[PDB]
């Protein structure tokens, strides 16, 4: 656990609420080492007056995050858990969540989306690198979706990096998870298929003509999402593999990264 002095942390502004207390955008001095300087951070807080049950759940979240070190996984830079309000200090992803990022790219102008196919393929590749890391660590995510991924830039020109953050969402859940409550790395592969469909559609809601409860049945009955408009067939083929009814027939995250990597190389050669 990376204990950090709260005296070196400034809470600058409110970003949202989340689940335990409030989430702020802040500044942490030398949180990377003694020379580092002032670096922009996001601070997850546990409201003062929280019960022991809430403190234990907050401690569990800090423990979970302390295990990740990957370019495509959100990093916990420090914790301030000795006093109230308790803090979990994270790297600030200035672009915000991927769902909002994708949606704004689509709706900014009728000339076209602010993201191209090669931008969207790079997003898929970057998330799949994160998933390969998680599979290698034996960490089951349970909630892969664009609303849980973050982008490093807010604009659509600068080089960007996407990271997996936030560790029922029926529209993202695998059949076994809906029927038996089974959550494995194979069910995460299902959600990854939904997330790449989110990317290629630029943040459209999965199964738009279905309700949450009709999604529960439609998915158990063999029904899948519609192919995104003009979606390259290699990406649609990969997506349908992710949605195999039986978890054992779905590809591994390492295979998915290879498939995305092959498509990106093939496409760039054209």
Q: Which residues are annotated as a binding site?
A: 15-23, 44
Q: Which tokens go with 238? A: 């990969």
CA distance 171 to 193: 11
How many CB atoms within 10 Å of residue 114?
18
List the x/- string, 199-218, binding to ligand AWJ by CB under 6 A: --------------------
Asked if 16 is part of the footprint of ligand AWJ (rule: CB under 6 A), the reply reads yes
**Is the Cβ–Cβ distance between 60 and 52 less than 8 Å?**
no
Q: What are phi and psi of 142, to 5 degrees?
A: 75, -15
Asked if 100 is part of the footprint of ligand AWJ (rule: CB under 6 A), the reply reads yes
How many C-alpha atoms does 174 have within 13 Å on its Cβ side? Answer: 31
User: Considering beta carbons, is residue 89 or 256 the nearer one to ligand AWJ?
Assistant: 89
The answer to whether 234 is a known catalytic residue is: no
Q: Which of helix, strand or coil describes residue 226?
A: coil
CA distance 146 to 64: 20
Strand ranges (E), 172-246: none
Binding to ligand AWJ (CB under 6 A): which residues in 29-58?
42, 44
Contact pick of 31, 92, 145, 194 for ligand AWJ (by CB under 6 A): 92
Binding to ligand AWJ (CB under 6 A): which residues in 130-159?
148, 150
92-100, 217-225, 226-234, 255-263 -> range binding ligand AWJ (CB under 6 A):
92-100
Residues making up the annotated binding site for ATP are 15-23, 44
Give least dist CB 90 to ligand AWJ, A.
Answer: 4
User: Considering beta carbons, is residue 145 or 174 the nearer one to ligand AWJ?
Assistant: 145
Terminal Cα-to-Cα distance of the chain (whole angstroms): 48
User: Considering beta carbons, is residue 96 or 232 the nearer one to ligand AWJ?
Assistant: 96
Catalytic residue among 143, 166, 234, 258: 143
CA distance 136 to 126: 16
| Furthest-apart CA atoms within the chain: distance in Å | 60
Contacts with ligand AWJ, residue ranges (CB under 6 A)? 15-16, 18, 23, 42, 44, 74, 90-93, 96-97, 100, 148, 150, 165-166
- Catalytic residue numbers read 143
């Amino acid at each position: 656990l990376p204990a950090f002095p709260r005296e070196k942390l400034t809470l600058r502004l409110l970003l949202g609420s989340g689940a335990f207390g409030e989430v702020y955008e802040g500044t942490a001095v030398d949180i990377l080492g003694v020379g580092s300087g002032e670096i922009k951070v996001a601070v997850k807080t546990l409201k003062k007056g929280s019960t022991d049950q809430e403190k234990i759940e907050f401690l569990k979240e800090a423990h979970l995050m302390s295990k990740f070190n990957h370019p495509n996984i959100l990093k916990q830079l420090g914790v301030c858990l000795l006093n109230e309000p308790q803090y979990i200090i994270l790297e600030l992803m200035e672009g915000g969540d991927l769902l909002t990022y994708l949606r704004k790219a689509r709706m900014a102008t009728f000339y076209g989306p602010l993201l191209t196919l090669v931008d969207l393929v790079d997003l898929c590749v970057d998330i799949s690198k994160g998933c390969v890391y998680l599979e290698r660590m034996h960490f089951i995510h349970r909630d892969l979706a664009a609303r849980n991924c973050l982008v490093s830039v807010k604009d659509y020109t600068s080089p960007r990096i996407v990271k997996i953050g936030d560790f029922l969402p029926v529209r993202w859940m695998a059949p076994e998870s809906l029927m038996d409550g089974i959550f494995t790395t194979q069910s995460d592969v299902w959600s990854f298929g939904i997330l790449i469909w989110e990317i290629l559609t630029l943040g459209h809601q999965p199964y738009p003509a279905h309700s949450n409860l009709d999604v529960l049945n439609y998915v158990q009955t063999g029904g899948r999402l519609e192919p995104p408009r003009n979606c390259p067939d290699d990406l649609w083929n990969l997506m349908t593999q992710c949605w195999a009814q039986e978890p054992d027939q779905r590809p591994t995250f390492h295979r998915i990264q290879d498939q995305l990597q092959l498509f990106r190389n093939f496409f760039l050669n054209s």
